[PDB]
Amino acid sequence: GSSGSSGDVIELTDDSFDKNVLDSEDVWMVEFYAPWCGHCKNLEPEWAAAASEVKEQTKGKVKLAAVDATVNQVLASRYGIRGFPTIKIFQKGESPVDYDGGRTRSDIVSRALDLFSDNAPPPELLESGPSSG
Template sequence: MQTFFKGRVLDNYGNVQGKWFIKFYVPWCPHCQHLAPEWAKMAHSVDEEVNVGGVDCTKHDDLCMFYEVYAYPTIYYIDDSLGMVKYEGRRAAKDLTKYIQNQEYNNEDATNAKDIQKFKQMSDFDKLRGIFGLG
């Protein structure tokens, strides 16, 4: 599992352009622990055009505060050209995968200009170095 995420996410940490499906979590959270195997299944099945990662909020609390993460897990679909969408659906691998596939064809849920600007500010790359991973 670590090798998969190292190849898909950590080796590309400087390039946050494109499409990302990111979970914000804390290791001690029962809901986050329950999500972990489903998230891993989904990550193995999605299209190469969508990057999958996670942010451990116990290690990167500044980023979690920036994204206004107050509950765990919180999941965002991020498209650098359209903005952020908070995922509110079921957390089974098949549901997560279906959501990503739908987002590739339906971007009408992209958030407002304020959220797009927030994402573009975070795309300065320096603040995001090394945080999109499962560690």
């Protein structure tokens, strides 16, 4: 996760991916890239930065991760990832969506926010809840 020179990009596998996302009630932005593709190499940094700008803006609610469609087949096949980069969003409870647009932290982040509100509560005092139920 956090090491060397890189933003807050989390590496998930074809097995843990479900144990990290499904096992969490938070938005997980799964992005599939190829180590032999340019369109991705240019996003490498764009995603790293965005992750931080998104995690800080979403207070951790909306996290950003990356996957290697070259090693991940279970997932890639599940939805069918052949055209990288491939940004996909997953929200515990409702079906996941397909992100298609600007490939720059500027845009990537802009979206994450549009969701943050959906799940995570807005900036305004509010009761927590009696034992979450």
